[PDB]
Scaffold this active site. Structure first.
Site, mmCIF file in Angstrom:
data_model
loop_
_atom_site.group_PDB
_atom_site.id
_atom_site.type_symbol
_atom_site.label_atom_id
_atom_site.label_comp_id
_atom_site.label_asym_id
_atom_site.label_seq_id
_atom_site.Cartn_x
_atom_site.Cartn_y
_atom_site.Cartn_z
ATOM 1 N N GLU A 69 40.704 43.574 34.494
ATOM 2 C CA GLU A 69 39.651 43.751 35.489
ATOM 3 C C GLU A 69 39.854 45.042 36.282
ATOM 4 O O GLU A 69 40.081 45.037 37.492
ATOM 5 C CB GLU A 69 39.578 42.541 36.422
ATOM 6 C CG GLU A 69 38.671 41.437 35.930
ATOM 7 C CD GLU A 69 37.230 41.888 35.810
ATOM 8 O OE1 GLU A 69 36.877 42.909 36.437
ATOM 9 O OE2 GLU A 69 36.452 41.228 35.091
ATOM 10 N N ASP A 70 39.769 46.160 35.568
ATOM 11 C CA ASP A 70 39.783 47.478 36.193
ATOM 12 C C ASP A 70 41.082 47.740 36.942
ATOM 13 O O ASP A 70 41.091 48.430 37.959
ATOM 14 C CB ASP A 70 38.597 47.644 37.144
ATOM 15 C CG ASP A 70 37.269 47.440 36.457
ATOM 16 O OD1 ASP A 70 37.179 47.708 35.242
ATOM 17 O OD2 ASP A 70 36.315 47.006 37.133
ATOM 18 N N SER A 71 42.185 47.181 36.464
ATOM 19 C CA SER A 71 43.502 47.483 36.993
ATOM 20 C C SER A 71 44.274 48.295 35.965
ATOM 21 O O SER A 71 43.908 48.353 34.790
ATOM 22 C CB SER A 71 44.265 46.205 37.345
ATOM 23 O OG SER A 71 45.551 46.513 37.847
ATOM 24 N N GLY A 99 40.560 52.192 39.103
ATOM 25 C CA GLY A 99 41.302 50.952 39.164
ATOM 26 C C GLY A 99 42.509 51.093 40.057
ATOM 27 O O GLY A 99 42.971 52.200 40.341
#
Ligand code: ZN
Ligand code: ZN
Ligand code: ZN
Lengths: 63, 115, 50, 67, 1131, 101, 46
Positions: E759-761, E900
RNA sequence: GACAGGUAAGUAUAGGGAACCCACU
């Protein structure tokens, strides 16, 4: 102190080295008089400089 | 500001047990070894050695949380065998492996040096 | 484009895949579409909040 | 601002290479040739050298706060 | 002689190189300010009417000419000083130069005795000076000189310094003046409305907006009525014409219609004649208009006089304001009516409001001109009042005392400081937003801010029509760069090659036309109009012509030769119509374009070679323009221009598409802006991601300015090891991203690994971070000053001691020195005094006013500066630097809309590794790419691997056919790698191969200013607001989070009544009160004596304690102030 | 009615000059007009000037209650910054009810 | 007590006393900087 | 008189607000 009409840096005639003194001609006589008191004692490039109205053609009997 | 000190990874804090033993009540002959300030290096070598051991019905390790520097090793042995004994023997065999590899590497390095 | 051109390229049909890249006109038209989407978001947020 | 001491990825010392790289570049080696001469095989180190911008000269263009 | 395509790439890029060398990037700002100072100030001064007074003695007081000095600053002794721009920044001065004028006061008392005296160089105020402008003292200074003066040579200037704060004027859009726009507004009572915002060249009077509407159908026909300035009612057009002095309907229709053979037009106009028939005399019409006036004068004579004045001066000023302009005014009004008729019948398309060619950009020039015009009017009024009051007693006055330079100086300072463009007292009525604080986060951010554009529509508008990207914006405005917030589409940026005209006088053009066969409007007869071609100059219909084609040819030849028509001038021939419009207005945007004749460029290999040797032969972009190969084009002219992507279009084809080209793009990539330019392969991304990157680039940390070491900027971030991207668009050569890169090339593996990058990390290499990867430093500048406002109470820096001063926290003051100032190289924590300051009271005679370090912050004192503010008071600025090591939660982003937070950091041994020792600096979840369409990201990674292996810099210029994925893959395979960039990676923890092959390679990443350390915040019973006792706001004040209305509603849905009560009452502002049980009003409760009394009921026993929120108590008190009885029945 | 200090708190300034509330300034204006009218009553004054004072007092009170009545001039604190009436305090979002309750 | 400040222009050291108007005795330049502290300062090389 | 050294006596080692702008999710 005011706009400068002309600036003259004197140089050694034979050696060409900088003499260390120049003549500055301002657009207005008042700008000059305004500089007479403030300019004296200024520090340019780390060395103190003095400033007085050039008397070579004003004061009688000056040399 | 919240960054943990780097040494915290490997330095046992005051009053920390390096290793702790528990019995997994779910099944017999099963122990859990919680080792602090250790990681996948030791976990993996020990797991592989225990798996090599035939009496070991169960051997493995895991890291409960990467941000924490603790590992848990679960080992289940046959009834005629102890997980503690299996663990000790696995460590001994790995130590022997390292000693043999060290001396052979010394010999090889020497020989390469002469030519 | 010539005047009164109703062709796909003229009216903004992107005949190239993202991998193939976009010719400048197609890129401009795609930017127009994305702008439409962004505006829709930025307005519907307040409408739906109310 | 200055060439990093180590390659971020692998940690190979590169801080002692910037001046030599510039010397080769003025010696007319292509950038790839200069990197090969310096021995930067891994493209991580090759990046470390290629992408670097030595801003320290522009910083030194200014006179120090103290004489 | 020609340029083959292979040569053409390099040729066009050399052309762009020369263009940028000549112009710079803030050329529009600098030119606008220079033109303002040079022309507009003198124009305003001359236009100002001289002031005459009567006590009899009469005075003239006329202004003659202006003289502007250079930025100067005076101390107490009166010594002027050259304010270093750096000095103004440091001492919170204002970079302005004093202004002067010549004044002639002539007195006449009796016997026409003239007492003409002249006062020269009368000081009248100061004008802030845009840096690097012609009149700035840094103008034309060498890079060595700038370095000596502590000024980054790359700094583009184009901004003012107000009290040491950098300010930049955002160009403001507006409808082009002196134009006829027909808009259909069915929503109103008008089927159609022509509109003209007439406005003389220069005039304190704002634009006079005149409407000419056609009433919606439904007595018999449809009537045309004009709404004029200073008139609250519409006027029949025939009435207006008769007032202008045209009674003969024949003459009126001659003015309006030009072909009487058009029964359609003529029948359609009949109803207006029918409506306006009774008034058959000019005097009658003038009386009618005067009566319709806002304040009609009972006298018919005065009514007619007022109407005549309104017509002559307030109606179509740009057409004329002097008498005898009636014929011109009538003809222009007839033309407006003709446009309305054409639109009504559909013969001509409605003008589009958002069509950008119908807009003008008020740069710093016009805006400052407007402000200065208002301020000069105020100064003249004040001088008039002063002189009048003194001469009323017969005694004379001193114009020098009359003049209040403060008017101009303070007004300019206030406007440029608060952005409220207008009078200080009319703050609300003025439009804010202009003059924003320059954004110095990075060089890219600064450039974008300097090139920013703003639409004054208003953020509250929900109309997507103005916000939508428009076709006209091609090449003029960056299609991608735009704020994603509520201001989407309203705030824009200039395309790289874009340029805004500063305007010019149309007098030479008019003279040339007169010399030419053009026929004056008054000279000609109405009949010739029908077939002839009308000619407009800035909206002024001057005359007609008979050979528009050759006329346009002559005009274009003149402009290309740079003989009489400067490049900025635009000329448009609406062939379908019969109009030729020539514009020399300022604010008209424009871009260069290569000229095409027949089917060949006018550019040549010789031109390319001369440009290559530009350094020596001095050949330049200006020389190109003079030679006429290239030409500026604005949007209106673009409407008629037929243009080609590249010389490839000129190349003959089996089915010639156009074969009649007239221009060719210098390079398509130029349509982008500053921020969008740094994107590699933008044409391989979904556009919204380009839009996002346009802002994330502004946030990236880098080296925002070369001379940061001296600037005591309020907030600054500096990356330890910036790097120019391995993959570069050719355009960044001019953004100077190479000089001031913001980001690091990093080995990125797009793989799933432990799930911590989901999730966009992004996972990060702890070992790299240790080696300095993306490490940065954050500089914060505090400032303080000791004020001697009053002898009774004065402030002083010192190391206060508890025995003397009283208001001391428990923080230790030892870090301070004897001067109340901390020293450089001193560690500091939050809430740690850094500037020991005290104030003399009216533990005794001294109250602490020290400045502490911001709570939760830490660092080391970078440096300290001590000066005197404008009023000699000691004034100290302290810059404190804190080393920010990237950590979990810090924001990172590629150049492809992919941002991120660092989910977790794994040491090198933990990170996965290739067969070689290489490990990814960053790992990003593959789930980003699928929906995002950031294929440009993957292509960038691939070409970055290729370039790193090859020892070169990849070229990701957007529309470059010479580069494509297949070629890049073949090159990569040549270097002993998988052709698509995949690789075999090993799990770091176990060594085992990974069943999949991970995509991995170099990619340019950039660390955004928003770090978790600057956002983490928590509270437990901190300080509370004064008005209501609720928790303070903002983490800087140790505030509390807002349990908002939707949170209340969600808890209501949960049914957690007790938790809701705790959140809103017991944890926010619990309060207790006493209430009379009878009247239900708060009662006086001296708890000490336990004396509870309600005055109204005079009772003391029937009082009940009630627990309520302090906010509720305040609400009840406010209602009772509104004279309401919110009685409180405890029963 | 006159709200207490807590409703219109005055903040001790960094400078010794205490800063007064907007409601406090409006009340000061109303009190000044009231005293002027009371004087013009206690001593005979032209009915016209009495009416003018009444009109001004009415305007001031109305603005104090609500400083946004259309058509009327807006009460202006200083340097042309409009006051904040009680109605504005309570009006909408960021008000006492929605903003604080 | 001494309070040496470095002038911006001439980079000259000069004493300044409290209540003393800030101006380099040498060049009349009004911008000065405190000298680097003498306190012990250490940095782990992390 | 000054100045350098020593002995004795006394002193010193409670928090802002509004407005606006920018930027962010
Ligand atoms: Zn490396
Ligand atoms: Zn009661
Ligand atoms: Zn100095």
């Amino acid at each position: 102190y005011g706009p400068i009409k002309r600036i003259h840096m004197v140089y050694s005639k034979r050696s060409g080295k900088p003499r260390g003194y120049a003549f500055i001609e301002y657009e207005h006589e008042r700008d000059m008089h305004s500089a007479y008191k403030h300019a004296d004692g200024k520090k340019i490039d780390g060395r103190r400089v003095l400033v007085d109205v050039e008397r070579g053609r004003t004061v009688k009997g000056w040399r | 500001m919240n960054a943990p000190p780097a040494f915290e990874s490997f330095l046992l804090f005051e009053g920390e047990k390096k290793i702790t033993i528990n019995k997994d009540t779910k099944v017999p002959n099963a122990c859990l070894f919680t080792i602090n300030k250790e990681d996948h290096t030791l976990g993996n070598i020990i797991k592989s050695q225990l798996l090599k051991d035939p009496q070991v019905l169960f051997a493995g390790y895991k890291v409960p949380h990467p941000l924490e520097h603790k590992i848990i090793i679960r080992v289940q042995t046959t009834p005629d065998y102890s997980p503690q004994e299996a663990f000790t023997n696995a460590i001994t065999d790995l130590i022997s492996e390292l000693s043999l590899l060290e001396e052979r590497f010394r010999v090889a390095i020497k020989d390469k040096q002469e030519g | 484009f010539i005047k009164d051109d109703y062709g796909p390229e003229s009216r903004g049909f992107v005949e190239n895949s993202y991998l193939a890249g976009l010719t400048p006109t197609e890129f401009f038209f795609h930017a127009m579409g994305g702008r439409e989407g962004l505006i829709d978001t930025a307005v519907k947020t307040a409408e739906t909040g109310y | 601002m200055i060439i990093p001491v180590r390659c971020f990825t692998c940690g190979k010392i590169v801080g002692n290479k910037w001046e030599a790289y510039l010397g080769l570049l003025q010696a007319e080696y292509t950038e790839g040739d200069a990197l090969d001469a310096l021995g930067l095989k891994r493209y991580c180190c090759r990046r470390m050298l290629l992408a670097h911008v030595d801003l320290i000269e522009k910083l030194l263009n200014y006179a120090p706060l103290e004489k | 002689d020609e340029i083959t395509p292979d040569l053409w790439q390099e040729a066009c890029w050399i052309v762009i190189s020369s263009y940028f060398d000549e112009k710079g990037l803030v050329r529009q700002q600098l030119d606008s300010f220079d033109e303002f100072i040079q022309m507009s100030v003198q124009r305003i001064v001359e236009d100002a009417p001289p002031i005459d007074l009567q006590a009899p003695p009469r005075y003239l007081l006329k202004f003659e000419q202006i003289y502007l000095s250079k930025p100067t600053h005076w101390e107490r002794d009166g010594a002027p000083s050259p304010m270093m721009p750096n000095e103004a920044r440091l001492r919170n001065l204002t970079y302005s130069a004093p202004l002067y004028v010549d004044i002639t006061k002539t007195v006449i008392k009796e016997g026409e005795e003239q007492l003409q005296t002249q006062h020269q160089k009368t000081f009248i105020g100061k004008i802030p000076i845009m840096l690097r402008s012609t009149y700035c003292l840094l103008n034309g200074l060498t890079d060595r000189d700038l370095c000596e003066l502590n000024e980054c040579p790359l700094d583009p200037g184009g901004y003012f310094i107000i009290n040491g704060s950098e300010k930049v004027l955002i160009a403001q859009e507006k409808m082009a003046t002196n134009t006829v726009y027909v808009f259909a507004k069915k929503d109103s009572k008008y089927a159609y409305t022509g509109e003209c915002r007439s406005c003389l060249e220069n005039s304190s009077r704002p634009t006079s907006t005149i409407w000419v509407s056609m009433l919606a159908r439904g007595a018999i026909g449809q009537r045309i009525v004009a709404t004029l300035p200073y008139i609250k009612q519409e006027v029949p057009i025939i009435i207006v014409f008769r007032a202008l002095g045209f009674v003969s309907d024949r003459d009126i229709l001659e003015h309006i219609i030009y072909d009487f053979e058009d029964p359609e037009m003529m029948e359609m106009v009949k109803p207006s004649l029918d409506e306006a028939f009774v008034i058959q005399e000019q005097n009658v019409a003038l009386n009618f208009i005067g009566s319709r006036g806002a304040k009609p004068g009972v006298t018919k004579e005065k009514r007619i006089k007022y109407a005549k004045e309104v017509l002559q001066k307030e109606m179509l000023p740009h057409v004329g304001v002097s008498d005898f302009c009636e014929t011109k005014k009538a003809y222009f009004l007839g033309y407006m009516v003709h446009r309305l008729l054409l639109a009504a019948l559909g013969r001509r398309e409605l003008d589009d409001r958002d069509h950008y060619g119908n807009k003008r950009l008020d740069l710093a020039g016009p805006l400052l001109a407007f402000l200065f015009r208002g301020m000069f009017k105020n100064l003249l009024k004040e001088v008039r009042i002063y002189a009048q009051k003194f001469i009323d007693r017969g005694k004379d006055f001193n114009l020098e005392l009359a003049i209040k330079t403060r008017i101009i100086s303070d007004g300019l300072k206030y406007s440029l400081a608060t952005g409220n463009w207008g009078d200080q007292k009319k703050a609300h009525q003025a439009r804010a937003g202009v003059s924003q604080v320059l954004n110095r986060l990075t060089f890219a951010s600064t450039l974008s801010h300097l090139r920013r554009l703003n639409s004054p529509i208003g953020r509250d508008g929900k109309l997507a029509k103005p916000r939508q990207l428009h076709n006209t914006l091609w090449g003029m405005v960056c299609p991608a760069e735009t704020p994603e917030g509520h201001a989407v589409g309203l705030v824009k940026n200039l395309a790289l090659m874009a340029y805004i005209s500063v305007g010019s006088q149309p007098s030479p053009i008019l003279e040339f036309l007169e010399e030419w066969s053009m026929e004056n409007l008054e000279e000609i007869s109405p009949a010739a109009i029908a077939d002839a071609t009308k000619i407009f100059v800035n909206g002024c219909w001057v005359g007609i012509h008979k050979d528009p084609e050759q006329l346009m040819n002559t005009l274009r030849k003149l402009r290309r030769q740079m003989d009489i028509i400067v490049s900025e001038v635009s000329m448009i021939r609406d062939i379908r119509e019969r109009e030729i419009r020539i514009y020399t207005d300022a604010g008209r945007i424009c871009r260069p374009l290569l000229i095409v004749e027949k089917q060949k460029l006018l550019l040549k290999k010789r031109h390319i070679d001369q440009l290559k040797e530009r350094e020596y032969n001095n050949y330049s972009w200006q020389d190109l323009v003079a030679s006429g190969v290239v030409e500026y084009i604005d949007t209106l002219e673009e409407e008629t221009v037929m243009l080609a992507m590249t010389p490839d279009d000129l190349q003959e084809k089996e089915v010639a598409y156009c074969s009649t080209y007239t221009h060719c793009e210098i390079h398509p990539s130029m349509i982008l802006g500053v921020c969008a330019s740094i994107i590699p392969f933008p044409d391989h991304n979904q556009s919204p991601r380009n839009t996002y990157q346009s802002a994330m680039g502004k946030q990236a940390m880098g080296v925002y300015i070369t001379n940061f070491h001296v600037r005591m900027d309020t907030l600054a971030h500096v990356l330890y090891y910036p790097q120019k991207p391995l993959v570069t668009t050719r355009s960044m050569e001019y953004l100077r991203f190479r000089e001031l890169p913001a980001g690091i090339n990093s080995i990125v593996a797009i793989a799933s690994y432990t799930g911590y990058n989901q999730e966009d990390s992004v996972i990060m290499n702890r070992s790299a971070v240790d080696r300095g990867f993306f490490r940065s430093v954050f500089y914060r500048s505090y400032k303080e000053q000791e004020s001697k406002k009053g002898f009774d109470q004065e402030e002083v820096f010192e190391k206060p001691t508890r025995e003397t001063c009283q208001g001391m926290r428990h923080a230790i003051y030892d870090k301070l020195d004897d001067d109340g100032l901390i020293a450089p190289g001193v560690r500091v924590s939050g809430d740690d005094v850094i500037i020991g300051k005290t104030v003399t009271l009216p533990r005794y005679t001294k109250r602490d006013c020290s400045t502490f370090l911001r709570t939760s912050e830490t660092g080391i004192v970078d440096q300290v500066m001590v000066t005197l503010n404008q009023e000699g008071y000691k004034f100290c600025k302290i810059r404190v630097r804190s080393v920010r090591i990237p950590q979990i939660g810090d924001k990172f982003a590629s150049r492809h809309g992919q941002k991120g937070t660092c989910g977790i950091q794994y040491r090198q041994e933990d990170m996965p590794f290739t067969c070689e020792g290489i490990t990814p600096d960053i790992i990003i979840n593959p789930h980003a790419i699928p929906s995002r369409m950031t294929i440009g990201h993957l292509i960038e990674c691939l070409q970055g691997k290729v370039s790193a292996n090859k020892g070169e810099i990849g070229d990701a210029t957007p529309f470059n056919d010479a580069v494509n994925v297949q070629k890049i893959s073949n090159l990569l395979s040549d270097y002993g790698y998988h052709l698509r960039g995949n690789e075999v990676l090993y799990n770091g923890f176990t060594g085992r191969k990974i069943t999949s092959q991970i995509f991995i390679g170099p990619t340019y990443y950039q660390r955004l200013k928003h770090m978790v350390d600057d956002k983490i915040h928590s509270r437990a019973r901190g300080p509370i607001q004064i008005l209501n006792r609720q928790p303070m706001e903002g983490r800087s004040r140790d505030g509390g989070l807002r349990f908002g209305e939707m949170e209340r509603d969600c808890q209501i849905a949960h049914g957690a009544a007790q938790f809701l009560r705790e959140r809103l009452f017991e944890a926010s502002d619990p309060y207790q009160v006493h209430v009379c049980n009878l009247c239900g009003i708060m009662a006086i409760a001296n708890t000490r004596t336990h004396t509870y009394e309600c005055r109204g009921c005079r009772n003391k026993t029937q009082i009940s304690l009630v627990r309520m929120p302090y906010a509720c108590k305040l609400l009840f008190q406010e209602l009772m102030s509104m004279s309401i009885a919110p009685r409180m029945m405890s029963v | 009615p006159v709200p207490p200090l807590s409703v219109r708190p005055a903040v001790v300034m960094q400078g010794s000059a205490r800063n007064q509330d907007d409601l406090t300034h409006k009340l000061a204006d109303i009190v000044k007009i009231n005293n002027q009218l009371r004087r013009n009553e206690q001593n005979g004054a032209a009915a016209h000037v009495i009416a003018e004072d009444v009109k001004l007092l009415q305007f001031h009170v109305a603005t104090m209650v609500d400083n946004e009545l259309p058509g009327l001039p807006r009460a202006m604190q200083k340097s042309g910054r409009p006051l904040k009436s009680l109605k504005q305090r309570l009006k909408g979002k960021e008000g006492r009810v929605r903003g604080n309750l | 007590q001494p309070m040496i400040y470095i002038c911006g222009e001439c980079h000259t050291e000069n004493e300044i006393k409290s209540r003393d108007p800030i101006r380099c005795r040498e060049c009349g330049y009004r911008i000065m900087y405190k000298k680097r502290t003498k306190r012990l300062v250490v940095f782990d090389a992390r």
